[PDB]
Write a protein that binds this ligand. Structure first.
Ligand SMILES: Nc1ncnc2c1ncn2[C@@H]1O[C@H](COP(=O)(O)OP(=O)(O)NP(=O)(O)O)[C@@H](O)[C@H]1O
Ligand SMILES: Nc1ncnc2c1ncn2[C@@H]1O[C@H](COP(=O)(O)OP(=O)(O)NP(=O)(O)O)[C@@H](O)[C@H]1O
Ligand SMILES: Nc1ncnc2c1ncn2[C@@H]1O[C@H](COP(=O)(O)OP(=O)(O)NP(=O)(O)O)[C@@H](O)[C@H]1O
Ligand SMILES: [Mg+2]
Ligand SMILES: [Mg+2]
Ligand SMILES: [Mg+2]
Ligand SMILES: [Zn+2]
Ligand SMILES: [Zn+2]
Lengths: 401, 619, 440
DNA sequence: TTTTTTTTT
């Protein structure tokens, strides 16, 4: 026997109204098919409790729409084709023009690396990305598409969330007087992705809650009569504006990105997206946007293939099953790249912060592209592509220099 | 001939008893590999088990000699002997356990020609699952699960036989309580009146019962689940055998019971409540420094420990074996070794109070990406009694103790916090600079006086908290600033800073060769250290047996070094030294002598302690 | 001589004679209790005598007249029944009992007869008696009483009085004897040894030095602070105006302010160890309810009651407050309102009362900027309000002298403490602390 | 009643 409470979906609610709820009783083989934070399709019988009566729903069948050896034919074509990396990058939100390297970074964050547990010491496997840019450059559109694409994911904004709604809360039941724990967004997103919009407008004492989650993947609580630890194995994708709403080319990187170094070291990639006027690029962008408004779909003027959202979700789910191992020959390339990266932060006029987390980031991105290739051994080509993406991310923060 | 069967199963009682008698008298197979908590018995003090005999026949000698009243039955041995009996034991524990007991008592009486005060009782153990994976098929079957103990109840008396007395003529009758029910007499056989008896409660017989609350381990769980809790019932001699803060494994029977809709009425709710009836608690774990004052170590391993102590490398050999995946930070590792060993205990035994603190407190402060949290995790996993807290996840009341109203009695009751659970252990506090000031300021009394005094509504008492504090933090700017002094890079009150015995400044020494070496070490994780089993025994033996005292030369030397500390701390932009630092120096000197297994502190030990204290802070 | 610990009270030991020790938390008021009763049969008017009561009010099972069939209709007679004085008390574990990481246990105690009201809250006592088991008497229905649960973890089932209900039990101690663990006519009565020793002490002309050096053996210097605390232990003479009702307060108040590691907590802990009725508290772990006196309501009864807090347990004694400056302003206002009037007032729910709080306060605090600043007056270096600062007779300021000779002396005193503890050896004080206790 | 926590003004 099991009991649930089920809420209305947002599209079902009337205008200017709040959703309602109902109690569901589940028996037998239909139990343990749901947990909190899932969207379900239910069939059941509506009954009273044994002249005014209370009611419930007796469930007959339940289906997770988060979940639902079988393969589709459209996926079989891709799995036979190979070389899919460019098409997979192009297929993320095709209404948005350009940003190919940003889409590649999001594609790597959707897959991630391997967890390592050498001699009792654990290391995080997933990748963290921070986006910044000027207003009107489609950050929110990209985050919305990623939230639709990922299996288990949560979306939050900087203003609408407390540091207790992100992590976990103590709830005092007024009926019994009891104390209990209630998991927040990073707990509900466990094993998946959390998207945080308007990241620069969060308070400091709310923002500092994610320091433990982003590196140790735990939440630990000691309050009232409660003392526990919760698992939070989530990737974080964040979006923000620079420190005064626009990038200033006269001020330093640390002045433009107004974050402390301890938080900055926890992000594997940091990107900047500018908007600058140009008489040809503006016309090309206007043509693309007006075509989308005319026809309801992207132009596809080159007639190249693109992948549906459903089969892209299927392909990413296939990619997550692999665990490619690192070749020991790649050692000198990786270590020499780390030393060369650490020289510039000493000898630059406009430096950034570099710490030993960087080399682990390199290894994570190499294993992520091997997973995208569906191979089982990491190649030097994947190592080189990780280095190319890190170089692009570094060069984004000094435009026109 | 009438014959007795278990209802609906065709199991006959005596045929099991024959095979179990054979098992007791004959099994000797596993004794080459006898376990850590099972290899000693006693007639007086302690003695060691012999391999060559039938094992449970050997274990019965303890019941004869030391008058122990129970036998721990390892079920792996029974499964090796006969699976056909192991299946019956696990499938029907509520029916077969009352007869394997009788076979044990029969064999004891036959072997020794003797009686005892209570019957020898069985405790089967080492049958493993998760709390969420239980199903209605598992009701009344034998299971085993593990977790941490958070709370224990006071004792409840549970009756087994009542005593009635006639109101008219003072005649008296006993009456057994069974199946949860008693039977009341109606007619007095002496004076022949009816509906006449009254129960006399204090002339009847009771037993002990205790409730224990158990919590899930968070490690195994799938995505998105929060940990669960379970009620465990202890009867008889298992009562008060466990404390809050302990980590245990439990073997017992999984049961289910109904509940009344109204307490006034006969109707029941059709959804049942579940619990566990305990049969065995185990706390032995080999992955940690052991939890038992080191009573069971053999003479040969004691002599191996004594031989190992004569290396001149003993500090480096013990220190570098701790946290093996962490590269360099040898000075910090030596500080953590001093934290593990500690000073000499100095208690008033008439009042059971600490006269002076002997625990060592350590702060780590440095740049990002320098493995401070990883060192905290290593110390957290190594010790048996440890707690981990972090940042704004704690409150001032949750760290120490809280008051809450009881569910049924409606009284205000007191319940523990992290520092009380970490008694005789370590509390690790991560992101120490980012706590609330209200939460951080309660640490003063615990870190100095090792006690905790409370005065709230109806509750005035004092608790013991003999914990060691290990903390990690960043500077004010998150990266260390060279345009500022030490007491400006750190910003904590002097009242708080003076209570740490060691402060480690960890500033990034930027160098290409060091970068290349650390990069090689980190990349290699994807492609003469002392054994853990020897390190456990070394630390336990040293703590149980070594108590250093100061020599007179050492005391004079300590006064001279304290005067030098008072002059050095007075200079500009530096942490000042108080008389508290003299106590810190004495503690570190005693820790060094304790590592060397010496009963006396020497001038060399004082010199090493002072050098460690000085070089920890000169950065 | 057979003491047992509170955690050792198993269900085995019901009915045997046992000794125990504990600290008393509550002392409920006095009631008469019925012991042996007389009942008149309503049908025939015969009196049935000596019906012995259990925990519950009971009528006879049968009329005493052999030619009468009544078994239900009875009326109690008061002037033939016998009544017993009764009192209920709660106790707590003493601190020396406690195991590792543990919270103290509590017991309910029943007292009868001449021992009623012989003891007060805050006392520490030895009890001789027996362990008993009492039932949940509200579940039963008999002639003369129906069940309270019917009017308004599994138990025993089967009795005629328990129709569908079930019975459960609690532990309690039935005390047989209770006592505390430890003027010219009194002076005559303490005749040989006490008058000889105390008269020699009174003749001693250096008794000030000889008492302070024995009360504070582990602390160097600070002669002014030692003498002031010693005078605080004695206090002045309290006086009443003969008809106005006003009074002149005899209690002395002392406050300590100073730099870190100046032995403030050492002094406070030493005072609380020495004095008979003293209590120690921290300002960070206290509330206005728990400090002085509080309102509670019962659940065995249901009426409102008063808890004597730490100041009232230290009435005619010393209350030590460490880290005074870290209290909330609410709790500081509560302490100041109590210190002004030497009384506590209660007006909440269904109780109004006023109480006495004749306690001397000893307090410690740290200066606001971490170190004491000699260039400013005392009002700026301490975060107290001026009305609260007006309540103290003596302020003492303690500073780090930064002097080589004093540093050497302090270091020698600390190492002498360590050396004495290392060999279980007492110092050679002029007098015993017990003799000083008798003198004070 | 008194105590502890998280959102709001
Ligand atoms: N390159 C682009 N291609 C298509 N639509 C675009 C592009 N750039 C901007 N837009 C449109 O601009 C609008 C604003 O998008 P939005 O995601 O809110 O920008 P933003 O980066 O979030 N600005 P802000 O949230 O204020 O920092 C949407 O309607 C987008 O469709
Ligand atoms: N010397 C080292 N030995 C081993 N691992 C290291 C070393 N230096 C850095 N690391 C790795 O770098 C990361 C350091 O993370 P962490 O343990 O949080 O350091 P930290 O001192 O706590 N930084 P922070 O908590 O942000 O102030 C981990 O992934 C470590 O495995
Ligand atoms: N005059 C003294 N003689 C002996 N020991 C002293 C003296 N002054 C300070 N100490 C030592 O100083 C240490 C700290 O004592 P403590 O009682 O905590 O003083 P404190 O001022 O209350 N510290 P704090 O609570 O942080 O302000 C102890 O080890 C004392 O032995
Ligand atoms: Mg946006
Ligand atoms: Mg860390
Ligand atoms: Mg102090
Ligand atoms: Zn009879
Ligand atoms: Zn009659």
């Amino acid at each position: 026997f099991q009991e649930l409470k089920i809420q209305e979906l947002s599209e079902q609610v009337p205008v200017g109204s709040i959703p309602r709820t109902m109690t569901v009783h589940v028996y037998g083989e239909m139990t343990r098919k749901c947990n909190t934070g899932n969207v379900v399709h239910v069939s059941g019988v509506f009954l009273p409790i044994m002249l005014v009566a209370d009611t419930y729903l007796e469930a007959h069948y339940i289906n997770n729409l988060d979940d639902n050896g079988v393969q589709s034919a459209e996926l079989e074509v891709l799995r036979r084709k190979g070389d899919n990396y460019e098409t997979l990058a192009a297929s993320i939100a095709p209404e948005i023009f350009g940003h190919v390297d940003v889409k590649k970074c999001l594609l790597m964050a959707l897959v991630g690396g391997n967890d390592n547990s050498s001699n009792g010491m654990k290391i995080r496997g997933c990748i963290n990305v921070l986006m910044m840019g000027d207003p009107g450059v489609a950050k929110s559109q990209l985050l919305g598409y990623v939230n639709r694409l990922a299996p288990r994911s949560q979306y939050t904004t900087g203003r609408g969330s407390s540091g207790v709604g992100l992590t976990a809360a103590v709830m005092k039941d007024p009926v019994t007087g009891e104390m209990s724990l209630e998991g927040g967004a990073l707990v509900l997103a466990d094993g998946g992705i959390c998207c945080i919009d308007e990241f620069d407008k969060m308070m400091d004492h709310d923002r500092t809650a994610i320091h433990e989650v982003m590196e140790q993947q735990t939440i630990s609580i000691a309050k009232a009569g409660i003392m526990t630890t919760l698992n939070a194995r989530t990737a974080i994708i964040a979006a923000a504006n620079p420190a005064y709403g626009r990038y200033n080319p006269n001020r330093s990187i640390e002045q433009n990105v107004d974050l402390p170094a301890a938080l900055l070291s926890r992000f594997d990639l940091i990107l900047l997206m500018q908007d600058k006027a140009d008489r040809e690029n503006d016309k090309i962008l206007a043509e693309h946007i007006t075509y989308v408004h005319q026809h309801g779909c992207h132009p596809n003027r080159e007639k190249k293939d693109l992948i549906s959202l459903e089969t892209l979700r299927e392909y990413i789910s296939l990619c997550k099953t692999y665990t490619p191992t690192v070749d020991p020959a790649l050692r000198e390339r990786i270590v020499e790249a780390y030393v060369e990266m650490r020289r510039d932060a000493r000898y630059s006029s406009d430096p950034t912060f570099v710490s030993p987390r960087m080399i682990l980031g390199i290894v994570r991105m190499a294993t992520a592209r091997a997973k995208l290739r569906l191979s089982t051994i990491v190649d030097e080509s994947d190592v080189e592509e990780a280095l190319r993406l890190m170089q692009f991310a570094k060069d984004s923060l000094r435009p026109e220099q | 001939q009438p014959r007795l069967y278990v209802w609906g199963t065709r199991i006959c009682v005596a045929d099991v008893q024959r095979s179990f008698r054979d098992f007791l008298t004959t099994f000797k197979i596993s004794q080459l590999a006898e376990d850590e908590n099972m290899m000693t018995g006693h007639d007086e003090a302690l003695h060691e088990i012999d391999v060559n005999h039938p094992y449970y026949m050997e274990r019965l000698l303890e019941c004869n000699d030391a008058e122990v009243t129970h036998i721990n039955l390892n079920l792996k041995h029974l499964n090796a002997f006969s699976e056909a009996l192991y299946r019956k034991v696990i499938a029907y524990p509520a029916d077969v356990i009352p007869y394997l007991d009788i076979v044990v008592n029969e064999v004891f009486a036959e072997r020794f020609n003797r009686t005892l005060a209570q019957s020898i009782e069985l405790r089967p153990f080492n049958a493993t699952r998760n709390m969420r994976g239980l199903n209605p098929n598992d009701v009344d079957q034998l299971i085993t699960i593990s977790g941490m103990v958070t709370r224990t109840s006071s004792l409840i008396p549970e009756m087994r036989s009542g005593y009635f007395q006639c109101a008219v003529c003072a005649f008296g009758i006993e009456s057994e309580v069974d199946k949860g029910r008693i039977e009341e007499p109606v007619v007095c056989t002496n004076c022949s009146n009816t509906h006449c008896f009254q129960l006399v409660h204090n002339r009847s017989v009771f037993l002990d019962k205790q409730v224990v609350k158990l919590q899930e381990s968070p490690d195994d769980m799938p995505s998105g689940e929060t940990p669960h809790t379970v009620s465990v019932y202890a009867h008889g001699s298992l009562v008060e055998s466990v404390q809050p803060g302990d980590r245990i494994t439990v073997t017992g029977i999984f049961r289910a019971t109904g509940m009344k809709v109204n307490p006034k009425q006969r109707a029941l709710a059709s959804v049942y409540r579940t619990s566990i009836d305990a049969l065995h608690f185990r706390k032995m774990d080999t992955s940690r420094l052991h939890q038992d004052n080191g009573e069971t170590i053999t003479e040969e391993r004691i002599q191996q420990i004594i031989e190992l102590s004569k290396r001149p490398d003993i500090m480096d050999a013990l220190a570098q074996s701790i946290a093996p995946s962490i590269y360099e930070h040898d000075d910090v590792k030596r500080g953590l070794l001093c934290l593990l060993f500690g000073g000499t205990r100095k208690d008033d035994e008439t009042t059971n109070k600490t006269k002076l603190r002997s625990e060592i407190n350590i702060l780590l402060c440095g740049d990002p990406g320098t493995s401070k949290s990883q060192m905290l995790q290593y110390v957290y996993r190594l010790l048996p009694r440890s707690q981990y807290t972090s940042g704004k996840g704690s409150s001032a009341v949750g760290l120490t103790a809280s008051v809450s109203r009881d569910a049924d009695t409606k009284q205000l009751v007191l319940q523990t916090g992290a520092l009380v659970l970490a008694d005789n252990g370590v509390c690790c506090i991560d992101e120490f600079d980012k706590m609330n000031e209200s939460a951080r300021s309660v640490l003063h009394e615990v870190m100095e006086q090792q006690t905790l005094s409370i005065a709230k509504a109806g509750i005035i008492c004092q608790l013991n908290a003999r914990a060691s504090v290990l903390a990690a933090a960043n500077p004010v700017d998150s990266k260390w600033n060279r345009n500022k002094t030490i007491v400006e890079n750190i910003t904590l009150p002097h009242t708080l800073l003076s209570r740490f015995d060691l402060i480690f400044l960890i500033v990034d020494a930027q160098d290409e060769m060091q970068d290349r070496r650390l990069g090689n070490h980190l990349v290699s994780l994807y492609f003469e250290h002392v054994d853990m089993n020897l390190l456990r025994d070394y630390i336990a033996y040293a703590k149980a047996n070594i108590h250093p005292k100061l020599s007179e030369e050492a005391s004079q030397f300590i006064i001279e070094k304290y005067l030098f500390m008072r002059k050095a701390g007075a200079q500009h932009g530096q942490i000042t030294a108080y008389p508290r630092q003299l106590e810190s120096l004495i503690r570190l000197s005693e820790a060094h002598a304790k590592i060397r297994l010496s009963q006396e502190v020497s001038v060399d030990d004082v010199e090493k302690a002072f050098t460690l204290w000085r070089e920890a802070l000169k950065q | 001589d057979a003491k047992t610990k509170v955690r050792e009270l198993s269900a085995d030991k019901v009915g045997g004679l046992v000794r125990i020790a504990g600290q008393i938390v509550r002392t409920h008021p006095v009631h008469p209790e019925l012991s042996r009763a007389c009942f008149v049969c309503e049908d025939c008017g015969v009196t049935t005598r000596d019906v012995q009561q259990q925990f519950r009010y009971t009528q006879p099972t049968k009329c005493a007249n052999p030619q009468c069939m009544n078994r239900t209709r009875f009326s109690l007679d008061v002037n033939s029944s016998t009544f017993v004085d009764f009192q209920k008390i709660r106790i707590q574990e003493t601190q020396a009992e406690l195991p590792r990481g543990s919270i103290p246990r509590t017991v309910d105690v029943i007292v009868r007869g001449e021992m009623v009201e012989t003891v007060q809250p805050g006392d520490k006592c030895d009890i001789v008696g027996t362990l008993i088991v009492i039932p949940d008497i509200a579940q039963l229905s008999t002639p003369g009483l129906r069940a309270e649960t019917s009017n308004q973890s599994e138990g025993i089932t089967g009795l005629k009085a328990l129709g569908v209900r079930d019975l459960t039990y609690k532990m309690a101690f039935l005390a047989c004897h209770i006592q505390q663990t430890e003027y010219l006519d009194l002076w005559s009565k303490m005749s040989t040894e006490d008058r000889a020793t105390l008269k020699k002490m009174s003749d001693d002309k250096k008794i000030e030095k000889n008492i302070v050096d024995s009360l504070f053996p582990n602390i160097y210097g600070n002669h002014e602070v030692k003498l002031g605390v010693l005078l605080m232990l004695l206090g002045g003479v309290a006086k009443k105006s003969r008809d106005e009702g006003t009074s002149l307060r005899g209690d002395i108040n002392v406050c300590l302010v100073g730099d870190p590691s100046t032995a403030k907590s050492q002094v406070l802990k030493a005072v609380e160890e020495f004095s008979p009725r003293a209590i120690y508290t921290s300002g960070k772990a206290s509330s206005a309810a728990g400090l002085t006196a509080a309102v509670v309501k019962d659940e065995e009864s249901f009426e409102f009651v008063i808890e004597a807090g730490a100041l009232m347990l230290a009435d005619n004694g010393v209350c030590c407050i460490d880290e005074f400056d870290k209290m909330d302003l609410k709790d500081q206002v509560a302490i100041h309102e109590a210190m002004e009037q030497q009384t506590i007032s209660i007006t909440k729910a269904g109780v109004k009362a006023t109480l006495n709080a004749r306690a001397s306060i000893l307090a410690a605090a740290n200066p606001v900027n971490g170190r004491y600043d000699r260039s400013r007056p005392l009002k700026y270096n301490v975060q107290m309000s001026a009305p609260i600062m007006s309540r103290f007779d003596l302020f003492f300021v303690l500073v780090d002298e930064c002097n080589e000779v004093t540093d050497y002396a302090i270091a020698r005193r600390i190492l002498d403490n360590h050396r004495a503890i290392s060999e279980h050896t007492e110092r050679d004080s002029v007098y015993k602390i017990d003799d000083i206790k008798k003198y004070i």
